[PDB]
Structures are given as C-alpha cells and as structure tokens.
C-alpha cells in the first residue's frame, strides 16, 4: 500500500522522535508545553539579537532582541490558544493533549516556557 523507506523506518529515528516531548504520550500537557516553549524561546532569541535594526548599537541589541523574541512567543501562544479553541469542540490510548483542556494547558505551558527561555537566553549572553 504505502511506500516504506529506511528514512521513515529506521529504529534510530523512531527512537529519536519518541524521545521528543510531543511524542511522550503520558506526561502532563503543561509540562510538554513548558519544555517545548523553553527549547523554542532559547533559539528564537538569536535572530532578533544578531540581525534586528538595533544590532549595531551596544548595550541595547540584546535588550531589543529579547523583547522581540518575547513578543513573538506571546503571538505564538495566542496562536496555540486559538488553534485549540477551533480544533477541539466536540467528541494505544487517547492522548490528553488533543483536547480542549489539554491544548489550553499546553498553550499556557508554552507561553511560560517561551518567556522563561527568552529570559534565560538574554542572561546567557551577559
């Protein structure tokens, strides 16, 4: 039926994907959101810091970059919240993340983790 290849059938990549927080299937959604948010905010703080309009002025490039990354994390959190509200409206085991309450807790955890990751990336450059 479907096409099987070593890229999608290797046990190493399957274990790597299963080790990711999104494919844990059994932990609290807020913890998953916190982990994903931290991992995303830490990498997100970089481009705004090194390439923004205030990248050449000293003592404020990191400030502006971190604030921009924080705003982006806030926008992504709002996107996650509206996605959860418009996706789960009615109706192994079923993952609790794919539910209204689960996705709302996931979005809140993502917001907290993203802001913490941005703040940690800002102090890591000092």
Partner 1 sequence: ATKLFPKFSQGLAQDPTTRRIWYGLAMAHDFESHDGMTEENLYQKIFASHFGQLSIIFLWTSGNLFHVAWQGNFEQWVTDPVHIRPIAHAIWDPHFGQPAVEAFTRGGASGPVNISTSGVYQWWYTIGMRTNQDLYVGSVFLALVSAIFLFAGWLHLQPNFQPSLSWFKDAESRLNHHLSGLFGVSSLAWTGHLVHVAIPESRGQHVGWDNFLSVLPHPQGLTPFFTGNWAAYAQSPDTASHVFGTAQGSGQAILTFLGGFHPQTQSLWLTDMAHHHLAIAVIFIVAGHMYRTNFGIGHRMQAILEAHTPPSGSLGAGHKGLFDTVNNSLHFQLGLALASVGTITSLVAQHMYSLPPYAFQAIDFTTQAALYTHHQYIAGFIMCGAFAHGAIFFIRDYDPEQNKGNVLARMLDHKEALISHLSWVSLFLGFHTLGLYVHNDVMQAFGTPEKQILIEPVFAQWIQAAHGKALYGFDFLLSSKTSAAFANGQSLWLPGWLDAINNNQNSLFLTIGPGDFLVHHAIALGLHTTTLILVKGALDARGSKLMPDKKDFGYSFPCDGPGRGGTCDISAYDAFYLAVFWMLNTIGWVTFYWHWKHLTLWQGNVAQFDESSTYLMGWLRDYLWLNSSQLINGYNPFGMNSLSVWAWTFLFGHLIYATGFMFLISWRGYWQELIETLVWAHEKTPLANLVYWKDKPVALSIVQARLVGLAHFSVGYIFTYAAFLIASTSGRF
Partner 2 sequence: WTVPTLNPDTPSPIFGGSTGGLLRKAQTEEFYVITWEAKKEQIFEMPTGGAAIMRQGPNLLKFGKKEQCLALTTQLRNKFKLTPCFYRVFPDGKVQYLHPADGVYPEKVNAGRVGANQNMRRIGQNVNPIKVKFSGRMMSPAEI
Partner 3 sequence: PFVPPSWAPSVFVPLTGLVLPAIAMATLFVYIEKEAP
Show binding-site residues for chlorophyll a.
16, 22, 35, 40
Residue 93 makes contact with partner 2 by CB under 8 A:
no
Quick one: tokens of 39? 């991992």
Contact between residue 27 and residue 97 where contact means Cβ atoms under 8 Å apart:
no
Distance CA 45, CA 73 (A): 10
| CA 20 to chain CA mean position, Å | 12
Residue 85's binding partner, choosing from partner 3, partner 2, partner 1, none, with beta-carbon cut-off 5 to 8 A by kind? partner 3
Binding residues vs ligand CLA (CB under 6 A): 48, 52-54, 64, 67-68, 70-71, 74-75
Site residues (vs partner 2, CB under 8 A)? 1-4
């Amino acid at each position: 039926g479907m096409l099987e290849t070593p890229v999608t059938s290797a046990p190493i990549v399957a274990t790597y994907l299963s080790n990711l927080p999104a494919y844990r299937t059994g932990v609290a959604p807020v913890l998953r959101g916190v982990e994903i948010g931290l991992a995303h905010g830490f990498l997100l703080a970089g481009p705004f810091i090194k390439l923004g309009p205030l990248r050449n002025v000293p003592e404020t490039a990191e400030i502006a970059g971190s604030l921009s990354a924080a705003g982006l994390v806030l926008i992504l959190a709002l996107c996650l919240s509206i996605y959860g509200s418009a996706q789960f409206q009615s109706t192994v085991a079923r993952d609790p993340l794919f539910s209204a309450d689960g996705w709302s807790e996931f979005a809140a955890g993502f917001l907290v983790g993203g802001e913490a990751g941005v703040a940690w990336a800002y102090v890591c450059t000092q």
